[PDB]
Coordinates of C-alpha atoms and ligand atoms in Angstrom, one line a residue:
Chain A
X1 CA 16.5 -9.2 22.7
X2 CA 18.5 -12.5 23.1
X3 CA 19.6 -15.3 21.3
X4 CA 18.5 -18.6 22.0
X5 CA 20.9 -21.3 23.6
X6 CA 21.1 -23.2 20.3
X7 CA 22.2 -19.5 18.3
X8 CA 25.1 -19.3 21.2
X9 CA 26.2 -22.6 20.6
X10 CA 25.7 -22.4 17.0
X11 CA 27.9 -19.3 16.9
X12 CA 30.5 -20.9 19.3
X13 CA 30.9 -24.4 17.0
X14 CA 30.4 -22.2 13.5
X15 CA 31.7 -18.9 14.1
X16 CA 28.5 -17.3 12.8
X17 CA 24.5 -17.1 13.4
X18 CA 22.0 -16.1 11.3
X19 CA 18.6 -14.0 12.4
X20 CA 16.3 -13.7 10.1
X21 CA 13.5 -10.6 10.1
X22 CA 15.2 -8.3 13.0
X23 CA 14.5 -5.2 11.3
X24 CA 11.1 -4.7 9.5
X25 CA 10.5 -3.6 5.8
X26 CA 10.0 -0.1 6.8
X27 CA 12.8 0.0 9.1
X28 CA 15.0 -1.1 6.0
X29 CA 13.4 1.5 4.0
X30 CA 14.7 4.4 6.5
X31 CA 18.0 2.8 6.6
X32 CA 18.2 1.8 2.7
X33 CA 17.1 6.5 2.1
X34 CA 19.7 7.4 4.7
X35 CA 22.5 5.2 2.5
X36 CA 21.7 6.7 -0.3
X37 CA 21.8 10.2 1.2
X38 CA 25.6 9.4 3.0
X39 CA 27.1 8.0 -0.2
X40 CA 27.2 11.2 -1.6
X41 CA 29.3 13.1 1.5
X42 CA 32.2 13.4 0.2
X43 CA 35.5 12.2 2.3
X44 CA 38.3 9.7 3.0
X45 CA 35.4 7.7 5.0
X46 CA 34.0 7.1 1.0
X47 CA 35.8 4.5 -0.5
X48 CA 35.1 3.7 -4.6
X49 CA 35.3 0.5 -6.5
X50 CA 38.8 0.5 -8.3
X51 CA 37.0 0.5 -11.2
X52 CA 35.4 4.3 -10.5
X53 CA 31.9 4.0 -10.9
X54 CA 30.1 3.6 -7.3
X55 CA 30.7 3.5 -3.8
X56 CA 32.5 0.4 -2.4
X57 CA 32.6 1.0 1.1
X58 CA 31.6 3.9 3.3
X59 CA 32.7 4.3 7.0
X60 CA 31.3 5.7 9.9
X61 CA 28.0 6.7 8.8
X62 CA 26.8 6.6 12.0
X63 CA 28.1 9.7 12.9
X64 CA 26.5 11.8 10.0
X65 CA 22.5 9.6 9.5
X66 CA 20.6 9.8 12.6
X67 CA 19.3 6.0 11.6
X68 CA 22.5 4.3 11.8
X69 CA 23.1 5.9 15.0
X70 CA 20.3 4.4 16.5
X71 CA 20.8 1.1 15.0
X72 CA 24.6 0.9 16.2
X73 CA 22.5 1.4 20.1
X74 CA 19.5 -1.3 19.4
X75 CA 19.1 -3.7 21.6
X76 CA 18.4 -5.6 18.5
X77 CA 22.1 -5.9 18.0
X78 CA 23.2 -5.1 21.4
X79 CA 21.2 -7.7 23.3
X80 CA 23.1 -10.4 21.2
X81 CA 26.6 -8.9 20.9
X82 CA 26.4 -8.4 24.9
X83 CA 25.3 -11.6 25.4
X84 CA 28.4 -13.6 23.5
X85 CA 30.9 -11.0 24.9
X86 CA 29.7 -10.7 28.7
X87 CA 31.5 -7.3 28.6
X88 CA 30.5 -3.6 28.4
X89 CA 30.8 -2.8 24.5
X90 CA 32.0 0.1 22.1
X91 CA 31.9 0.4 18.4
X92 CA 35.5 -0.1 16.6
X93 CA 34.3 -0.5 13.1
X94 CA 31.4 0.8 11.5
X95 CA 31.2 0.0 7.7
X96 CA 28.7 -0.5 4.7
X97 CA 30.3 -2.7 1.9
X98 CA 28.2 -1.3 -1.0
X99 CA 28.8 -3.9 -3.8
X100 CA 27.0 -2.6 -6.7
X101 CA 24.7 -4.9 -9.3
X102 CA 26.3 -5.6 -12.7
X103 CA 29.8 -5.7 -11.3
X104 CA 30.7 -4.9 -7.7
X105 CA 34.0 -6.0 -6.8
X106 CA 34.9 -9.4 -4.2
X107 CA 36.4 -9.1 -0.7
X108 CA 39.5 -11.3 -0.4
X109 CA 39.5 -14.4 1.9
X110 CA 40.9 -13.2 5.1
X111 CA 40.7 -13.2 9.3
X112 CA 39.9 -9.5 10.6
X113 CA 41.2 -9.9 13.7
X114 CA 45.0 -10.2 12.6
X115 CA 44.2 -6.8 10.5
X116 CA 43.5 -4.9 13.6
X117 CA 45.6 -6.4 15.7
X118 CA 48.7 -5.6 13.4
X119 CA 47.5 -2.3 11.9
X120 CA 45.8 -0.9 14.8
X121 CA 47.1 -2.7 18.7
X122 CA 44.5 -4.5 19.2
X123 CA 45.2 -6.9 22.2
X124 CA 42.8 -10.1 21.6
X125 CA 39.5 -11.0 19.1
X126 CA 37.4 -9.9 22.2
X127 CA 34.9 -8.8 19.6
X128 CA 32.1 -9.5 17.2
X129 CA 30.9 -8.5 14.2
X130 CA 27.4 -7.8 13.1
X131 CA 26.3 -7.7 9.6
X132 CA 23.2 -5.9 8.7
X133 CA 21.5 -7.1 5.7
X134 CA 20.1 -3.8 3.9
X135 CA 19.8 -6.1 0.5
X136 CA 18.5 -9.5 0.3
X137 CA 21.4 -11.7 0.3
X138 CA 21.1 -14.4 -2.4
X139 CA 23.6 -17.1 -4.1
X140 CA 23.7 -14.5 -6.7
X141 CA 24.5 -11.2 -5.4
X142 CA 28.1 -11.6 -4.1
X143 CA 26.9 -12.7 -0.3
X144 CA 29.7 -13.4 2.7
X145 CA 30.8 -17.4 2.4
X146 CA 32.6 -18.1 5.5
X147 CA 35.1 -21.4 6.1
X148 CA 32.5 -22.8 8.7
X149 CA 34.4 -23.5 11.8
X150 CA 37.6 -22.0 11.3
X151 CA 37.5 -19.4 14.3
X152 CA 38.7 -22.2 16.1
X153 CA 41.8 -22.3 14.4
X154 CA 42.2 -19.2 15.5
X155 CA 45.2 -16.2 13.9
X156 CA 46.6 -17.8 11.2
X157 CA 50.4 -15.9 11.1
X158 CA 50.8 -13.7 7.8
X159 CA 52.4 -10.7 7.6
X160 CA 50.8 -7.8 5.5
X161 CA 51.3 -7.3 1.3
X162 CA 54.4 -5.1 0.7
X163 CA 51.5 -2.9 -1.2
X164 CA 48.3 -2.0 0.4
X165 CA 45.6 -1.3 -1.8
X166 CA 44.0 1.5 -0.3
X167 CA 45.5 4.6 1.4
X168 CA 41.7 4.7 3.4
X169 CA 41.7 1.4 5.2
X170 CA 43.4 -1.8 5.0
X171 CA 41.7 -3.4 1.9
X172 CA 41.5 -7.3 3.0
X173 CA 43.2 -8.0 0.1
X174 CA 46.1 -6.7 2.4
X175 CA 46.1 -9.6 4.1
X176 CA 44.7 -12.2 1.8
X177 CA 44.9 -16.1 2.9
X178 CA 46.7 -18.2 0.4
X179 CA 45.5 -20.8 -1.9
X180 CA 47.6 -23.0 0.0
X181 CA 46.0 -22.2 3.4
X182 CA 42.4 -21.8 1.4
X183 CA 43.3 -25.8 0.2
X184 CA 43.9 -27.2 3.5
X185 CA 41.5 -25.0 5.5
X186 CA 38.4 -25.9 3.5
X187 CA 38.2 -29.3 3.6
X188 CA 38.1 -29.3 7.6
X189 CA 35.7 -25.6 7.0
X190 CA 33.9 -25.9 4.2
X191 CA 32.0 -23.2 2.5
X192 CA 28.8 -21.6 3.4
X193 CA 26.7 -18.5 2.5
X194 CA 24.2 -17.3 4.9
X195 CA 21.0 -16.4 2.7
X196 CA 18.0 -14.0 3.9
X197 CA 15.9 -10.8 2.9
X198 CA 17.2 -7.1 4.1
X199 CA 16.6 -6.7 7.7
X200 CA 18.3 -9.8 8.5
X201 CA 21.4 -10.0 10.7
X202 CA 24.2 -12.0 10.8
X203 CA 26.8 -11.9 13.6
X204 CA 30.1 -13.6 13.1
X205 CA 33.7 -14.0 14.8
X206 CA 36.5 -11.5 13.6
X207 CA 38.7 -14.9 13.3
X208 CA 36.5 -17.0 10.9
X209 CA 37.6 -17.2 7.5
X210 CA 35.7 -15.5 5.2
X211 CA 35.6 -14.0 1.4
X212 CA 32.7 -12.9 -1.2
X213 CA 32.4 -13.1 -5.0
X214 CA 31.9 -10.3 -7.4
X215 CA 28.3 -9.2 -7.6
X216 CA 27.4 -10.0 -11.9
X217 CA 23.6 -9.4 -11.1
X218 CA 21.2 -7.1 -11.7
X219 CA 20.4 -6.7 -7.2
X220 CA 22.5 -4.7 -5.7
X221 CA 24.3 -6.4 -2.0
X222 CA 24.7 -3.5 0.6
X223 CA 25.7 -5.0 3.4
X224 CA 26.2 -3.0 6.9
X225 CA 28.6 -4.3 9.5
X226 CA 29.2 -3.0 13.1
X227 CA 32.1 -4.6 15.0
X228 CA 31.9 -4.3 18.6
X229 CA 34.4 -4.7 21.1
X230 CA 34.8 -5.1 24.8
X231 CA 35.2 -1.8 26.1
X232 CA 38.7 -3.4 28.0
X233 CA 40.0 -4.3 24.7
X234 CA 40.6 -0.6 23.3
X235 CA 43.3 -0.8 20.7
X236 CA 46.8 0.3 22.1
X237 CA 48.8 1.5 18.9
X238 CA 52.6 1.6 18.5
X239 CA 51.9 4.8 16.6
X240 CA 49.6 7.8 15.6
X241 CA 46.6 5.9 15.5
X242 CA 44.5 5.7 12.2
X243 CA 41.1 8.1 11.7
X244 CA 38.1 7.7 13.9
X245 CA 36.2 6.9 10.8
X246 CA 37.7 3.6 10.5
X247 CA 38.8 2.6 14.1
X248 CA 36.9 3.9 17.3
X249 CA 38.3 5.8 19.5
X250 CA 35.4 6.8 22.6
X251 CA 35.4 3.5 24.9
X252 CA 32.1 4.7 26.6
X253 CA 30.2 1.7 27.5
X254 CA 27.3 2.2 25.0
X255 CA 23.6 2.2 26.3
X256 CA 21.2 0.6 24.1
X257 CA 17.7 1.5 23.3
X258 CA 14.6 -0.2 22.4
X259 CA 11.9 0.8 19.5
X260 CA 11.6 1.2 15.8
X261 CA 14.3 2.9 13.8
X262 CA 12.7 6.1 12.5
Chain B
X1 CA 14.4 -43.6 -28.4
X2 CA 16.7 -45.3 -25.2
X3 CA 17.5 -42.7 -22.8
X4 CA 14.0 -40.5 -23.1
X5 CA 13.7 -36.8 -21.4
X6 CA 10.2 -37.7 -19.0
X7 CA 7.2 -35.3 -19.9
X8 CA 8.4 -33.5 -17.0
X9 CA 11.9 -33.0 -18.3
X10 CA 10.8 -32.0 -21.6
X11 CA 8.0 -29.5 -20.5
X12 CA 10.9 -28.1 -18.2
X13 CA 13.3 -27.6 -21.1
X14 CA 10.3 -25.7 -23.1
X15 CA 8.8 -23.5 -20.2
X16 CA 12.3 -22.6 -18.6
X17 CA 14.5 -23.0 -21.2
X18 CA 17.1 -26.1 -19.5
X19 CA 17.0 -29.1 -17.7
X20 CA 19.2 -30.5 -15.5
X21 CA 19.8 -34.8 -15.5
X22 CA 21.7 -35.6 -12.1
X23 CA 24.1 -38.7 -12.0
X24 CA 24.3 -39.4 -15.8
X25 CA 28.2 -40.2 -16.1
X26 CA 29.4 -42.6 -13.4
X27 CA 32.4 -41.5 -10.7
X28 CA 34.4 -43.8 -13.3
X29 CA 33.7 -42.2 -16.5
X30 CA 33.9 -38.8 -15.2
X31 CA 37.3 -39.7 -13.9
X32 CA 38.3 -41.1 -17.0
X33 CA 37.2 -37.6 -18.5
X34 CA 39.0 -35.7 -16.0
X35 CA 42.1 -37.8 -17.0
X36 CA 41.4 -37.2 -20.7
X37 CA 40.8 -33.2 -19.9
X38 CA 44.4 -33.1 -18.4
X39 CA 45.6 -34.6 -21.2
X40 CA 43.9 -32.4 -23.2
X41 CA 45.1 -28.5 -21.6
X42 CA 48.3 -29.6 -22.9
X43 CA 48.2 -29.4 -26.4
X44 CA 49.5 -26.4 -28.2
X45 CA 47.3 -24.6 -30.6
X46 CA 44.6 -22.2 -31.8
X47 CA 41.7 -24.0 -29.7
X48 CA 43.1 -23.8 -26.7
X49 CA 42.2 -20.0 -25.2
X50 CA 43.8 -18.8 -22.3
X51 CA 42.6 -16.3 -19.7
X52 CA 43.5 -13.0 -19.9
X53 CA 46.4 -13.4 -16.6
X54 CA 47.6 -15.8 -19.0
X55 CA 47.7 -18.2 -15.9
X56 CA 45.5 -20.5 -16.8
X57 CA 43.2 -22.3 -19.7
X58 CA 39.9 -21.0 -20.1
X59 CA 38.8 -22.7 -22.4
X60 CA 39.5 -25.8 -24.9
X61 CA 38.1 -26.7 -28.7
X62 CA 37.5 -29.6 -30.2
X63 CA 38.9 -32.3 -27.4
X64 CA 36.6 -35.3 -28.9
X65 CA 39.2 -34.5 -32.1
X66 CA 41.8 -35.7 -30.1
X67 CA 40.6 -37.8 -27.2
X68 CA 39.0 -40.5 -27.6
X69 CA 37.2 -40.5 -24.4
X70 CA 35.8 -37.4 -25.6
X71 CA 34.3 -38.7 -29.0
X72 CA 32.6 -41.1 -27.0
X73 CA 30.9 -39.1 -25.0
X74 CA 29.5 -36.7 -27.9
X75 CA 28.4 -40.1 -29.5
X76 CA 27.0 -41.5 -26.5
X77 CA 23.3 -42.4 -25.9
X78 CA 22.5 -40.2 -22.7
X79 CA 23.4 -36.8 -24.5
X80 CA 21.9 -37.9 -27.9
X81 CA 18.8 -39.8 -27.0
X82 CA 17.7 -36.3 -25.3
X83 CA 18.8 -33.8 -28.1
X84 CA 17.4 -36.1 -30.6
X85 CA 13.9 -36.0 -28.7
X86 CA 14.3 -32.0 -27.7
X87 CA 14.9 -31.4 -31.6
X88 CA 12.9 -34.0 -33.7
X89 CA 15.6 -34.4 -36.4
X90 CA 19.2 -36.2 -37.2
X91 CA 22.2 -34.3 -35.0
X92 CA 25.2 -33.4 -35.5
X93 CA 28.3 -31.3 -33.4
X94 CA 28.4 -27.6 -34.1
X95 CA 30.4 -26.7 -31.8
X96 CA 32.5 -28.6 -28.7
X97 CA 34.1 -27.0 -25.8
X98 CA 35.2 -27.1 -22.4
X99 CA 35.2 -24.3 -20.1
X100 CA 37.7 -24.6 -17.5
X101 CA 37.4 -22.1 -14.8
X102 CA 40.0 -22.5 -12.7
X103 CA 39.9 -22.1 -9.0
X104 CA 41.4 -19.1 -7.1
X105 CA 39.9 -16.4 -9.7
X106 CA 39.1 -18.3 -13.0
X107 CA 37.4 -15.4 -14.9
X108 CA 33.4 -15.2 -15.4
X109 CA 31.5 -15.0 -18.4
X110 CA 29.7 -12.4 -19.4
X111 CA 25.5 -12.3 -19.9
X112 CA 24.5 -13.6 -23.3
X113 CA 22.5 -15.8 -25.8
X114 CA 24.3 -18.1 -28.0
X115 CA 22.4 -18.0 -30.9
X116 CA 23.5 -14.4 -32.1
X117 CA 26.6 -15.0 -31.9
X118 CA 26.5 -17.8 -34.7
X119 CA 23.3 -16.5 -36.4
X120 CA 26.1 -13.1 -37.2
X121 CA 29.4 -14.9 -37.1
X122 CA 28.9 -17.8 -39.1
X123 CA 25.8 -17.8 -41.4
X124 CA 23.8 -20.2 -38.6
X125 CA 19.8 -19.8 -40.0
X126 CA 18.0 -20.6 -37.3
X127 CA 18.3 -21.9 -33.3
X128 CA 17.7 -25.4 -33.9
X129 CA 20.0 -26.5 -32.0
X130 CA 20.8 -27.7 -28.4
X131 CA 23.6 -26.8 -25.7
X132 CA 24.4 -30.1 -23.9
X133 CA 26.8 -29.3 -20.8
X134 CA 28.5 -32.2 -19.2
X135 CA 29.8 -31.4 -15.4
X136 CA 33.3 -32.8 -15.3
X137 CA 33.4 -31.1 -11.7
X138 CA 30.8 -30.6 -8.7
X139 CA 28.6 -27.8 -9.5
X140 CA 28.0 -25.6 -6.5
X141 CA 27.3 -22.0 -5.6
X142 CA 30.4 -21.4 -5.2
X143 CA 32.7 -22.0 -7.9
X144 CA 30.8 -20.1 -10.5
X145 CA 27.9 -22.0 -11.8
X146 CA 26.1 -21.1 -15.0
X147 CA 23.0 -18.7 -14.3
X148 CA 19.8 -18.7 -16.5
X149 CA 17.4 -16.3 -16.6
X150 CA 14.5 -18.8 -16.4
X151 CA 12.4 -18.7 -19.5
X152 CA 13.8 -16.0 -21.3
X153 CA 14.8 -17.8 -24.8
X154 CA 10.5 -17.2 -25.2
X155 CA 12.0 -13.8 -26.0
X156 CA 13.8 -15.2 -28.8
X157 CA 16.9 -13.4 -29.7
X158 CA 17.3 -10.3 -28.5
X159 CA 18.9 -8.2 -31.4
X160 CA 22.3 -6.1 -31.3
X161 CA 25.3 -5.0 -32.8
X162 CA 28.8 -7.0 -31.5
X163 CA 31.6 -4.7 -29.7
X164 CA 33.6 -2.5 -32.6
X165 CA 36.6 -5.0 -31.2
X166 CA 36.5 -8.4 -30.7
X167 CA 38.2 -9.6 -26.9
X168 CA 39.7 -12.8 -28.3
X169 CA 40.8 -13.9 -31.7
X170 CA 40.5 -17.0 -31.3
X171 CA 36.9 -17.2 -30.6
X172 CA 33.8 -15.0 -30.1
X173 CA 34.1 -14.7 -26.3
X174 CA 30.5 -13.6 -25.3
X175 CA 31.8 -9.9 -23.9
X176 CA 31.5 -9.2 -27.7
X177 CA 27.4 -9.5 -27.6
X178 CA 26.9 -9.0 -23.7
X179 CA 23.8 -7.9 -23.1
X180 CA 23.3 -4.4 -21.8
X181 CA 22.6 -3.6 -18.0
X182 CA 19.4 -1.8 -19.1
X183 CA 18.5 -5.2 -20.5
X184 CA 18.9 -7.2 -17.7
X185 CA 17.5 -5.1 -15.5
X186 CA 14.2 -5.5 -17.1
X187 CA 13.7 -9.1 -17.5
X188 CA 15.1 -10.2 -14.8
X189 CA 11.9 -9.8 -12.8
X190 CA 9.8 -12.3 -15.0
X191 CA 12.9 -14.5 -15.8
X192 CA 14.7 -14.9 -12.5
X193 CA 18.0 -15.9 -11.8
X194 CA 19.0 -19.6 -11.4
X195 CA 21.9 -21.9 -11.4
X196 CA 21.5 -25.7 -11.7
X197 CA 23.9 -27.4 -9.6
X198 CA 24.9 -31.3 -9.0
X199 CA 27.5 -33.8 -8.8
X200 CA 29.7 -34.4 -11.7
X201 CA 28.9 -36.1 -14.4
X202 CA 25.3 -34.7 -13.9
X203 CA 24.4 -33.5 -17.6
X204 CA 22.6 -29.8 -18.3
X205 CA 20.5 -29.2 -21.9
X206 CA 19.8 -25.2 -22.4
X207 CA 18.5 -23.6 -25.1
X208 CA 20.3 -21.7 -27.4
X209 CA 18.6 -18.2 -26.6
X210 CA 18.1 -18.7 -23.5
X211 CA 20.0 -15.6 -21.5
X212 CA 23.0 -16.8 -19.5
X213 CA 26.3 -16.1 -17.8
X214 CA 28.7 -16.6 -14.9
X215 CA 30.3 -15.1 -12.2
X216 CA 34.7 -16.1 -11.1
X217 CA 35.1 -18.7 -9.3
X218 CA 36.8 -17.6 -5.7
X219 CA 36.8 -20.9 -4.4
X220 CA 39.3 -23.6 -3.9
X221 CA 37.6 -25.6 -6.8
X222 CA 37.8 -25.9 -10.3
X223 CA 34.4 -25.9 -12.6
X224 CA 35.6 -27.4 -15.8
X225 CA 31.9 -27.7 -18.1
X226 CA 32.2 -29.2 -21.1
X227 CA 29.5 -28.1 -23.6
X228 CA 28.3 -29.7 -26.5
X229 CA 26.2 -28.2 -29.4
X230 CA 24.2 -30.3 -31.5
X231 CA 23.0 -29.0 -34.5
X232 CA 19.9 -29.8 -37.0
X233 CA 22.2 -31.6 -40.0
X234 CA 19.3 -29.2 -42.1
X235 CA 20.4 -26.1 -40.0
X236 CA 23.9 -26.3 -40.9
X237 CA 25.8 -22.4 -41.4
X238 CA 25.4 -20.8 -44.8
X239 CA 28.3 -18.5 -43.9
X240 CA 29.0 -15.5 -46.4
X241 CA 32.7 -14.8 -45.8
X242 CA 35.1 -17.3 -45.8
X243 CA 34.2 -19.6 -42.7
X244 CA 35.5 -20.2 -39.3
X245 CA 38.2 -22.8 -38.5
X246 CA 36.7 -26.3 -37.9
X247 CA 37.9 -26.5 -34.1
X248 CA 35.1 -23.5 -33.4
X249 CA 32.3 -24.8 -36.0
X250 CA 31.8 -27.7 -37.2
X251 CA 31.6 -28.5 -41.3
X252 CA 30.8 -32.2 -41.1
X253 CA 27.3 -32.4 -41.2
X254 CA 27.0 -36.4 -41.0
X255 CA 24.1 -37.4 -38.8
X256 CA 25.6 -38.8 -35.4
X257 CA 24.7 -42.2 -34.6
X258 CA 24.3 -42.6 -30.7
X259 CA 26.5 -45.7 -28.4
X260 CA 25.0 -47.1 -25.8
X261 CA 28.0 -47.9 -23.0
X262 CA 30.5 -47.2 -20.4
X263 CA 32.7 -44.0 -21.4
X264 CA 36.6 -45.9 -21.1
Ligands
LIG301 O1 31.5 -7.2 2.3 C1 31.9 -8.4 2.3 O2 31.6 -9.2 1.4 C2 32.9 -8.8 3.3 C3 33.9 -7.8 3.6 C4 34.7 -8.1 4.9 O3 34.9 -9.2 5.2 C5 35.2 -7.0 5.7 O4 35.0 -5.8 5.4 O5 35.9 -7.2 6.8
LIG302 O1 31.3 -21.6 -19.0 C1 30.3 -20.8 -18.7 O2 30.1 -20.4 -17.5 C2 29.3 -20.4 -19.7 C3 30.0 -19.9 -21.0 C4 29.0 -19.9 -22.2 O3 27.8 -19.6 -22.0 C5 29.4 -20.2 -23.5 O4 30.7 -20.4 -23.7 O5 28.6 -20.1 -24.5
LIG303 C1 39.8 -6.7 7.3 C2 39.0 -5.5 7.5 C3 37.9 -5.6 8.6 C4 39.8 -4.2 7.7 C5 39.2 -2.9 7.6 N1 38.9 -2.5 6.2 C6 40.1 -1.8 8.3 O1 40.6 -0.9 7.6 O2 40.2 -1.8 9.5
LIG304 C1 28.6 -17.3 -27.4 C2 29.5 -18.5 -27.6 C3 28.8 -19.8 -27.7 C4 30.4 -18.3 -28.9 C5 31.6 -19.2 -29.1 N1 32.6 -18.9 -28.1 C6 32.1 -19.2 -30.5 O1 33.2 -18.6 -30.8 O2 31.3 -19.6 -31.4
LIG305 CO1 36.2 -9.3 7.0
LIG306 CO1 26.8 -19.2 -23.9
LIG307 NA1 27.6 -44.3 -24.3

């Protein structure tokens, strides 16, 4: 499992790549029962809409749904993460952004990287994420737009909200960009949505802008994203460290493994 | 019978419910609008409603009252010669407004059909009528187009009771006859979502019952959509209360005669 030369240098120039079809119906079936089941484990790892009514974000399911363990070791995601990273890799993130129909919340325009690298020690955006599509992402349901490009701006210098949204993670409202910085950034980046059915992944840099919309339609958007990191990376906080449900902890080169997700 | 709507255009307009004309306004006229619309956000009154941060407009009645820029356009050949031929009958404005969602979290619209709304509020018979939206900025995915549900004003209006409270007194935003998850849900699947998007000063007909809405805009740009509604001069409100202010709906039931011309 590899990307081609033209992905590589499509993710180097844009800061994202798109692969359409990596998981198969029934693969996203499996995954889409085994969401449904960890939404309702209760926790800080559970995070709700402001609003009350569903799930916004959940953390870490991995560690409780046998199918997202082995999806965080397929070689399906691996292959490619390993392959722009040249590096043994760990998971530091594991996330689903549940963003219900008929009014799921935005995510703020923001840079990861700077996030973890404030928050949480981390030394440099030796990383990558991967997005799992477990919806079909459409111009209607709320889907990622990234500022094409602009990873190679790279950190753009903020410091954090004197309020934090959440007391579970660092909302990326935290560390919103301006409109300022939005103005100017855009028309050198501009604006694009990466569209495909569930099963589709999309891997992107933890320094390229990027923001979503409220979801107004009648589809649900869950969207799964594992962040990798080079095992010589490992965060080095300044202080008690947050929970291993949001930031990874066990640097142990992971393995992958080939097959269906059952 | 100037600017005609092709077969095509017209069988789109009946089967799905709108029809989008590309490139109708020149880069010139629409900046003349835009200058006009400026203008415009600055007058003090009852038609102008603000968002609910209070930050910015949302939305303005009544501009062709006092722009002239903007009479022109509701005059003007390539939004009449199409409404006349959609509706077989002499026109005039029921109702004029621009929506002006601003970027950097202009608020969204919530799912509806027009035609309740007056059918209720004002005493309007019968949906002969036709919304006319005028793109004074690029349409694009991102700044919170309009959505249709393709074809579903063949549903015709689907009935309800408005909210017990009323979001704005100054209009009937739609949140007052939104429809209900339930019933999007269930037409969605033979009426799918879709969003016509162009340039501005690209020009968008949509039926009156046909379901719509719109999401905020996140982006760095603006979406100001101007909307015209032309109604049957034989269609006019027969209102049973006492009526609306004139900056919502119109009283002046003289049949429009169309210019042909540059917008200035
Ligand atoms: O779920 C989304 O739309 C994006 C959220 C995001 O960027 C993040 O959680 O880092
Ligand atoms: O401006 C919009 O997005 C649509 C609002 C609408 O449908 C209306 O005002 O009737
Ligand atoms: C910007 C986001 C990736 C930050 C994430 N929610 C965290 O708490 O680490
Ligand atoms: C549904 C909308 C067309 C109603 C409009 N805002 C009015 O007050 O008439
Ligand atoms: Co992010
Ligand atoms: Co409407
Ligand atoms: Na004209």
């Amino acid at each position: 499992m590899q990307l081609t030369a033209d992905q590589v240098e499509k993710y180097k120039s844009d800061g994202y790549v798109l692969l359409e079809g990596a998981f198969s119906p029934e693969e996203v079936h499996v995954m889409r029962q085994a969401l449904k089941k960890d939404q309702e484990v209760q926790g800080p790892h559970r995070i709700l809409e402001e609003d009350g009514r569903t799930v916004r974000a959940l953390y870490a399911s991995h560690t409780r749904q046998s199918v997202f363990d082995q999806l965080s070791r397929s070689d399906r995601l691996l292959g490619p993460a390993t392959q722009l990273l040249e590096c043994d890799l760990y998971i530091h993130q594991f996330k689903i952004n549940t963003k219900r129909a008929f009014g799921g919340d935005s995510w703020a325009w923001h840079q990861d990287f700077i996030v973890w690298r404030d928050t949480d020690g981390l030394p440099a955006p030796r990383a990558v994420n991967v997005g799992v599509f477990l919806s079909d992402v459409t111009e209607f349901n709320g889907p990622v737009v990234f500022l094409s490009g602009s990873h190679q701006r790279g950190t753009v210098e903020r410091k954090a909200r004197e309020t934090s949204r959440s007391d579970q993670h660092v909302d990326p409202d935290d560390y919103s960009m301006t409109p300022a910085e939005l103005s100017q950034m855009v028309e050198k980046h501009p604006m694009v949505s990466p569209k495909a059915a569930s099963g589709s992944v999309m891997l992107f840099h933890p320094e390229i802008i990027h923001g979503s919309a409220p979801n107004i339609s009648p589809f649900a958007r869950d969207l799964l994203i594992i962040t990798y990191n080079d095992v010589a990376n490992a965060p080095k906080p300044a202080g008690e460290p947050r929970p291993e449900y949001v930031i990874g902890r066990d640097t142990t080169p992971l393995v992958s493994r080939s097959g269906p997700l059952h």
